[PDB]
Amino acid sequence: MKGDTKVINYLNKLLGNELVAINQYFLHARMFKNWGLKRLNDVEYHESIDEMKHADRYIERILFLEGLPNLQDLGKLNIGEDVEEMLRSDLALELDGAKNLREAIGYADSVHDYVSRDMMIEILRDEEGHIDWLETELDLIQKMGLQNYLQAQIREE
Amino acid sequence: MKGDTKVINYLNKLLGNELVAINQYFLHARMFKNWGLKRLNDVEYHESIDEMKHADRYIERILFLEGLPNLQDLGKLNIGEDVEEMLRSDLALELDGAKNLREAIGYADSVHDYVSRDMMIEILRDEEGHIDWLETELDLIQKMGLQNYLQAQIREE
Amino acid sequence: MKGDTKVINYLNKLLGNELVAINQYFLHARMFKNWGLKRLNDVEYHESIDEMKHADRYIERILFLEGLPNLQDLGKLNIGEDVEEMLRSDLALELDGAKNLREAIGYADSVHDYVSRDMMIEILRDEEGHIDWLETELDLIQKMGLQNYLQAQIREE
Amino acid sequence: MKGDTKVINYLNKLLGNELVAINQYFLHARMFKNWGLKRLNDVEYHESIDEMKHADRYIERILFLEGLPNLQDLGKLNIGEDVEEMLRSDLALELDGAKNLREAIGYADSVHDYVSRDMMIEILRDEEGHIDWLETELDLIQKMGLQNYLQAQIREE
Amino acid sequence: MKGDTKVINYLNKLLGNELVAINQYFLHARMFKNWGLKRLNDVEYHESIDEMKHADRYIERILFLEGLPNLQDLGKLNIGEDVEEMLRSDLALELDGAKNLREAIGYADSVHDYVSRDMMIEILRDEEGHIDWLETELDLIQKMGLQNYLQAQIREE
Amino acid sequence: MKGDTKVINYLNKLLGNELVAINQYFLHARMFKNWGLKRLNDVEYHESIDEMKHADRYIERILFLEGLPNLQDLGKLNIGEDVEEMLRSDLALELDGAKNLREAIGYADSVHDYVSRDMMIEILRDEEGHIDWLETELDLIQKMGLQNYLQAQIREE
């Protein structure tokens, strides 16, 4: 069913955001796992899988709309070297992604692509969940101190 | 069955205390949940449901005695901005509540409303349990320090 | 994640509507139960619980958006003294609430708060169910007459 | 297998009767559900479904006989505005349809289409059950009065 | 254990109230069953049994206190001839019995018979439930009229 | 609850679309079944049931909004005579219906009927699935040729 060209361009842009987040969260999860921070590996691994499922939904929607999914153009990763810097980099990426989502959702409504919009709102709700988790962990580091915070990560929850 | 007017007035006063406590505990619980303090969310939410059940018991008893439950006049909430201030505010509210309960219990006995009295003694028992929990947590903060105490709240028990 | 100030104000106003509805429905449920109208007790009790669940969603959303939930300012209850008066008061209240809901949903969209919008649309759907139930009962009183209507309430459904 | 032209014409006539009855019973059922008359929604929905299965049987039989089922020419619905008027309209429609069935059954026998005949007799048996249910409900309205009658419809059977 | 003489006298007075109520409720229940009012037979039979368990508790307590249970002096029954008169007679009897219970409870406290007191308060709680059921039924008769009220009694609940 | 008059008009137009689609998908299904194309019978039968469920949602919504469902005015069927023509006819009908949905969804938003809008977006989502299925089948016929395509339809999936 031929979709609106600019809607397909926005979906490719959001797919590009999910591709960056997949790699960044998956690498962060295995860095945490290597350091023995099991709880953080578990959450970040599951965050990584959520972004993979988001990428799948964009890929299928784009193809349904008769566009060409662009899995070629990976954007900048910001890996970071310590726990706080890693979580802050994830959070910055998420806030940028939500901004792009909000734009695409408004546009999709104005051209009456309500099914693309409905899918993007469900994805945005998941992203707000990822944001909440990141903001909360960053705050906990501040309130209990990094040493207590790291000790809390060693067992799976 | 027409009840004593002053007993109905005391029951409405106690109902009013429960209404404040329901709101204060429920909001505290969701504040803790938002901060990622799961154990405190769990306990405060259950303390909140306990007060809801107390409020139910007063409402039914007042109607049985042919009075008019007053759910309109909400007393002052004292929310607080940090863990210790919140728990201290719940404790202050509970202690004021137990005082009113003791007074009503004595009076119900004087006019031979022993069933309203039996109900109030059971609620007072529950309130002494909320007080015990609050006092103990405040003492733990002091003994282990705030950072260790916060760390201990992040997993459910 | 910092929310739009006016969205938070709308959320607090809708929360205020839920708090009124919780109390009014709960007290009506127990009045019905005291009169031995078990079926009306059951339905009104379940609507009060639905409104409690709505209040909880507003509270959690306001806190996530970094605002202050206002559980202090209870609006006017209109209790009523007989079955038809009580149902009509619940109806007027629902209709006023639905009006404020529609206004907030439109505004959430203008500022791209699509998750708050998506939440409030699910709550609106629930409110339209409460309205449908109230309007239907009111029409049944008219069609079968009050005595038959009361008779049909004495057994739980 | 090439069927008799007039038999196919009769089958299309009866299919037309079924298509009117599907819509009329379905709409009556949902009108009853909207009014809170659950018992009547339940019966009329199930009659609607009976008529749908009758239509399916005509369609398949016409196809087997190498004819063209006509689902295009919808006959006149008579919806009605209150319970008695709705039931009486369903009854008039069923009586008309039974008269057409009797004629078609006679004709199928004279051209030796005994399988079309046997199908139509099983459908006529179901229609006589529909007529019996309608005649009985209308008589109950008279005997107990409309107010008691409507009260009797509010719960599922 | 030798009990207080007046406490035993009060226990025998209350036992006497129970013995009247057993007979009156049992006979009312069977009168209702004979008339085909099954719901009322069911409730009144179960009230009869409650009173029997109350009597058993008085008998055992008087024996433990080294007193002589008096099952000889049956007080006045007031049976009544129609549903409302029967219920109103049960209610008057229960109100009288509650007044005697209140007096005995006050007295047991002043002589430090706290276990007799605790038993009597549990019995008073059950009696207030009996009073509530009666008051509610009598009000239902008024609100829906006697004919609808009797119709509502023909099936078991 | 009194709905917006133009919303009810749109709901009636959409209902009219579903009614055409019910009949056309149902007749196509049984034509495939008669031809021994069991796979196509199964899919088209399930699409017809999907449109019946859509039609039920429109009817209940219009009644809730105090409108009159119009099941009388059946639009034009285009049945077709061979597999490819029938599929193309279903596709043209679906695309016209999706255009009407988009218009109604926009309008519903402008008058704040967010629950009617929410219902229509779910239905649109289903229609886009119908569309995808039809487009895919039509492309398969071209890719593998009609003879292989027919062969693939004889067994149930």
Place this chain on the structure above:
Amino acid sequence: MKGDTKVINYLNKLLGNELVAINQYFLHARMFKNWGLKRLNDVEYHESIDEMKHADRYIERILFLEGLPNLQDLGKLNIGEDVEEMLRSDLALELDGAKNLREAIGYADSVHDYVSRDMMIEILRDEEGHIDWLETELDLIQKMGLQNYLQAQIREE
């Protein structure tokens, strides 16, 4: 445990080959799904998951050896527009990848990194499975012709 620098570089190169394969196979899988070729969607999806699992083993090994996994530099995708082109492209990618693997396995042995070698031989055996499946499918297209081959993909296996 500090690994050999050139081993880590080989590991990063092979991880790069997996990242290309994950994307190419996943998009191919969803392209097949869109065309209604379910059997091809299923196999290519499961091959993509295989590559994801390989990527994970490289990442974990590189971190264990204290190197930095490079998930930033994505190599050239060759997507293709029809089934045969897409399969040939996956085949070319696989053969290039197996070449890089053979080279790395040899070198791991020269520097006594036998655990890296053991991991890479297991991945190579999986890659030879992917190669076998692709060569086999390409040969089937030529032996049965593309129309029959496409017909054979529409049902899942």
